[PDB]
Amino acid sequence: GVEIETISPGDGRTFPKKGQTCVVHYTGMLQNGKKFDSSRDRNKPFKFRIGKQEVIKGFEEGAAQMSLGQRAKLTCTPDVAYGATGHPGVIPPNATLIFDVELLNLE
C-alpha cells in the first residue's frame, strides 16, 4: 500500500511513463524514529528510470501517481520493501517507511 499525502503545488498533468528517467529529491523517515537517507545531503538527486524494479515497490508506485512540481509524502508498508527481510543495520524487519518526495524531473 502506498499512501499519498501531497503538498499542493505542481501541474497535475506531467506524469511519468515507461522508460523515462525522473529526478526525485527524496528524504527518508522512520516511523517514531530518525532519518535514514536523504538526497539533500549528497545533492545528487537520484536520476532513476521507471519500469525496471530498481527502486522499492513502495517508492515506484507513488512516483507514478505524482506529477511535475508536486511534493507528496509516502507511507510505505513493510511487506513491499523490508518487513520480512530488513536491511542489515539500517532497516529492521517489520518497518513502516515514510518518505518526503518531490518530483522535479526530466524526460
C-alpha cell at 30: 522512520
The strand pair at 47-48 and 27-30 is best described as unpaired
Measured CA to CA, the distance from residue 5 to residue 9 in angstroms comes to 12
- With 0-12 / 13-18 / 19 or more C-beta atoms within 10 angstroms meaning exposed / middle / buried, residue 85 is exposed
Active-site position among 82, 91, 98, 100: 82
Measured CA to CA, the distance from residue 98 to residue 28 in angstroms comes to 6
Which helix (H) or strand (E) is 39 found in, with range?
A: helix 39-42
Grid cell 498533468 is found at 13
Residue 44 lies inside a defined structural domain of this protein: yes
Beta-carbon contacts of 89 under 8 Å, excluding residues fewer than 6 positions away, are none
For the question of residue 46 being annotated catalytic, the response is no
Residue 11 lies inside a defined structural domain of this protein: no
For the question of residue 82 being annotated catalytic, the response is yes
Residue 72 lies inside a defined structural domain of this protein: yes
* Experiment used for this model: cryo-EM
- CB distance 21 to 51 below 8 Å: no
Residue 13 lies inside a defined structural domain of this protein: no
Residue 95 lies inside a defined structural domain of this protein: yes
Active-site position among 48, 59, 98, 99: 99
The strand pair at 71-76 and 27-30 is best described as unpaired
C-alpha cell at 6: 501531497
Measured CA to CA, the distance from residue 63 to residue 50 in angstroms comes to 9
For the question of residue 41 being annotated catalytic, the response is no
For the question of residue 36 being annotated catalytic, the response is yes
What's 81's domain CATH number?
3.10.50.40
Structural domains counted in the chain: 1
Residue 57 lies inside a defined structural domain of this protein: yes
- CB distance 74 to 62 below 8 Å: yes
Segments forming the whole domain that contains residue 83 = 22-102
